[PDB]
Amino acid sequence: ETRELQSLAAAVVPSAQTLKITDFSFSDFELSDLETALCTIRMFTDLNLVQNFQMKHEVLCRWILSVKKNYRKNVAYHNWRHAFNTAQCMFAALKAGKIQNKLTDLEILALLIAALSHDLDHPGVSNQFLINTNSELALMYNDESVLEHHHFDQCLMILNSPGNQILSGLSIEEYKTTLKIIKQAILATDLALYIKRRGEFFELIRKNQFNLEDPHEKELFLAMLMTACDLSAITKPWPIQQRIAELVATEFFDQGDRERKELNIEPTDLMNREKKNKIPSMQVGFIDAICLQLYEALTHVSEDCFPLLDGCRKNRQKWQALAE
Numbered sequence: 001e002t003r004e005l006q007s008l009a010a011a012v013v014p015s016a017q018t019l020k021i022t023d024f025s026f027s028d029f030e031l032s033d034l035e036t037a038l039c040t041i042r043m044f045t046d047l048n049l050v051q052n053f054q055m056k057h058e059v060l061c062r063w064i065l066s067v068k069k070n071y072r073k074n075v076a077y078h079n080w081r082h083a084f085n086t087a088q089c090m091f092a093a094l095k096a097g098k099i100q101n102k103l104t105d106l107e108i109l110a111l112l113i114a115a116l117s118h119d120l121d122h123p124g125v126s127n128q129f130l131i132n133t134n135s136e137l138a139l140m141y142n143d144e145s146v147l148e149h150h151h152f153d154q155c156l157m158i159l160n161s162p163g164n165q166i167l168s169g170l171s172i173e174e175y176k177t178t179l180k181i182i183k184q185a186i187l188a189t190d191l192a193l194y195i196k197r198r199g200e201f202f203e204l205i206r207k208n209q210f211n212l213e214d215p216h217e218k219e220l221f222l223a224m225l226m227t228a229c230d231l232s233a234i235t236k237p238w239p240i241q242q243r244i245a246e247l248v249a250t251e252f253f254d255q256g257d258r259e260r261k262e263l264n265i266e267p268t269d270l271m272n273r274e275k276k277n278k279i280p281s282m283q284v285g286f287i288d289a290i291c292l293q294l295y296e297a298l299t300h301v302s303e304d305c306f307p308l309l310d311g312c313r314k315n316r317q318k319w320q321a322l323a324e
């Protein structure tokens, strides 16, 4: 809608202080859709992206609304609020977490765009489901990071749309570098790619060989940072984390309902509402095997990222208290 764009573009953008976007503890629960969009403008503004890249206000506002409308409203978890929270975590890690100091303006621009765009048009079902139902998307991307390639395709489509070209002011070499970083950052949100590459990151930190001047190490770090932001709701203060965990389970159970109807199978425990009693133990297993070492590794990179680790540890203990 053209009225919604005009409303957003004509609105006063409150400070980062007022919006509380610098806090790792931030919750979007009390915010209206308009407030999330103003928070998003504030993120680009305070990371010096609007001034640096000569972004026109109306074009940025149109792009933010185009990204928001390209998230489905019938998906419990992978909707606009999740993408918005991922970008807010990116902003907090860059500012309060001091990750901004370690990156170029181009890498920050690409990371913020990628965080907001990483789950575009998520259908509320996994890669395995798309492969299982012989989806045209699974065929195009040979069953590898299917959704992630589709999120990037949607990201590119919006970036190329008339009136939405926030990268129009970049030089050719900057534009090509940015799209490359965005693609790798979105593809990194595939947990199978995270498992595949994390060992290398953890060894580089352990051996004190971590060097962001090495282009391979920079790309690897950007990928790890994308996963850290993606999973960040798991580090939130318990009441916030618990409410988001309810949405995560709702979406997995919604998939299980589709699997029973369309595939005639008993879903895996993760996607089986009948086995909802497994939630606390599965949350503990997932935090231990996936989350903890990531937040520890990020804290080793920048000590100011510690609140993400602290929150992750406190939630692990609370889930374990429910599981045992």
Ligand SMILES: CCCOCCn1c(=O)c(NCCN2CCOCC2)nc2cnc(-c3ccc(OC)nc3)cc21
Residues within 6 Å of the ligand: 191, 192, 195, 231, 232, 233, 234, 235, 241, 242, 244, 245, 246, 248, 249, 252, 270, 279, 282, 283, 286, 290
């Ligand atoms: C709450 C729903 C049950 O949750 C059990 C743990 N849980 C899994 O068991 C799992 N298994 C497949 C991934 N696999 C697991 C094996 O290793 C490779 C990757 N995926 C999850 C993906 N997201 C989350 C999650 C939860 C809360 C939150 O914020 C609050 N943010 C993210 C949890 C997950």
Ligand SMILES: [Mg+2]
Residues within 6 Å of the ligand: 118, 119, 189
């Ligand atoms: Mg995703």
Ligand SMILES: [Zn+2]
Residues within 6 Å of the ligand: 082, 086, 118, 119, 189, 230
């Ligand atoms: Zn995500």
